[PDB]
Design goal:
It is classed as hydrolase. The complex is a heterodimer of chains A (307) and B (53). Chain A has 307 residues and is an alpha/beta fold. In chain A, a hairpin with a 4-residue loop joins strand 5 (129-130) and strand 6. Chain A starts with 10 loop residues before the first helix and ends with a helix. Helices cover 36% and strands 18% of the residues of chain A. Chain B is mostly beta strands. Chain B has strands spanning 7-8, 22-29, 36-44, 47-48. The chains are: A alpha/beta (307), B mainly beta (53). The complex binds 2-acetamido-2-deoxy-beta-D-glucopyranose (3 copies) and zinc ion (ZN).
């Protein structure tokens, strides 16, 4: 292909990329329908799996739950490309694929993401109408059934953190949650990619309580942050959302930990505020390369726990 | 339809990424049952900004 991973792509190009990458790597990748957005845009994930007789555990990664965070879908595509281009020759990727399958959701909030290209670059929420169309959008990362709407979320539909009309009320959330719920016993690690702030966040947002395996989570997280910084010197902070970012509820990260997935992280990618959400394309390649180091460090650690 | 006037947000809460930003309630005419559409807009130093990551 002549598909550049060093620029931002509108949704139509991502639909075509998923279809092309799936056929070119058909021996190890399949594309699966999860559901449709409010506006009937299809939501897919890519499953990377090297066929074998071993039972597989699952790594889940999703990007673009928040529409304006363009660096996150860029990284999901970078991740996929790196795995696929190196899954035969690279001993470390070949290792991971002997026992893990990767499920990657490149853009979850497709309606909002299209909206940021067509109309409003700083849109965050979905595009579902509320109050007879007088307001639009649910914050999909406040819509999961994890202490739903208890703190750090609004019941006001005009607010950027609107939690929705009820837990798992939006079609995007339903599609993710029902699927994840059906695989939960096999999912070892849940990664949700966001921007910006250069943080690696553990549960929880809705309490300052820590999960039962919090020491293990921040050891893995800090080693990943160290591996990331080694690349270009980018500084990341590791800790629970409530401690180092702000309180929230209904996040997919907390919901995943609550249903028993042992490693659940939110990554907040570049930068620290100079450009914010509108990260220049000149920073896509270095952001993705350093983030790749972090993610493979996590996957190495998760893997070493079992094989 | 009487489109509500733009005004400061009422009890807007924090803007964690830009703590001193200003929240405005902004409505525009729209083709729906009530004739308008509203949202909260955050601005700092003359530019719209995001508050949550
Ligand atoms: C939220 O989760 C609890 C289970 O812990 C469940 O009993 C309740 O029905 C759930 N609500 C939805 C809408 O899934
Ligand atoms: C925090 O943990 C304590 C037990 O250590 C528990 O009683 C409390 O309900 C927890 N808080 C939340 C919000 O889950
Ligand atoms: C607003 O929407 C509801 C549908 O949920 C409808 O019953 C109601 O009549 C609508 N109001 C107006 C003024 O159209
Ligand atoms: Zn986000």
């Amino acid at each position: 292909e002549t598909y550049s991973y060093n620029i931002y792509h509108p949704m139509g190009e991502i639909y075509e990329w998923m279809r092309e990458i799936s056929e070119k790597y058909k021996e190890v990748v399949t594309q699966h329908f999860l559901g449709v957005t409010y506006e009937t845009h299809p939501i897919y994930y890519l499953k990377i799996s090297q066929p074998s007789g071993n039972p597989k555990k699952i790594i889940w990664m999703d990007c673009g739950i928040h529409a304006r965070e363009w660096i996150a879908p860029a990284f999901c595509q970078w991740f996929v490309k790196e795995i696929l281009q190196n899954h035969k020759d690279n001993s470390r990727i070949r290792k991971l694929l002997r026992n893990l399958d990767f499920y990657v959701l490149p853009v979850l909030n497709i309606d909002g993401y299209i909206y940021t290209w067509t109309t409003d670059r700083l849109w965050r929420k979905s595009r579902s109408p509320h109050n007879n169309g007088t307001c639009f959008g649910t914050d999909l990362n406040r819509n999961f059934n994890a202490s739903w709407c208890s703190i750090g979320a609004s019941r006001n539909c005009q607010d950027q953190t609107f939690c929705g009309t009820g837990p798992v009320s939006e079609p995007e959330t339903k599609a993710v949650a029902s699927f994840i719920e059906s695989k939960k016993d096999d999912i070892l690690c849940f990664l949700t990619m966001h921007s910006y702030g250069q943080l690696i966040l553990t549960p929880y947002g809705y309490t300052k309580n820590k999960s039962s395996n919090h020491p293990e989570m921040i050891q893995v997280g800090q080693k990943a942050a160290n591996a990331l910084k080694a690349k270009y010197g980018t500084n990341y902070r590791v800790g629970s959302s409530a401690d180092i970012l702000y309180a929230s509820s209904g996040s997919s990260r907390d919901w995943a930990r609550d249903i028993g997935i042992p490693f659940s992280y939110t990554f907040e990618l570049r930068d620290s505020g100079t450009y914010g959400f509108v990260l220049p394309e000149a920073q896509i390649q270095p952001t993705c390369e350093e983030t790749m180091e972090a993610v493979l460090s996590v996957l190495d650690d998760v893997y070493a726990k079992h094989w | 339809f009487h489109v509500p006037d733009d005004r400061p947000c009422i009890n807007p809460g924090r803007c964690p990424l830009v703590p001193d930003a200003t929240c405005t309630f902004v409505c525009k005419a729209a083709d729906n049952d009530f004739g308008y559409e509203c949202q909260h807009v955050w601005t700092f130093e003359g530019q719209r900004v995001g508050c949550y990551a």
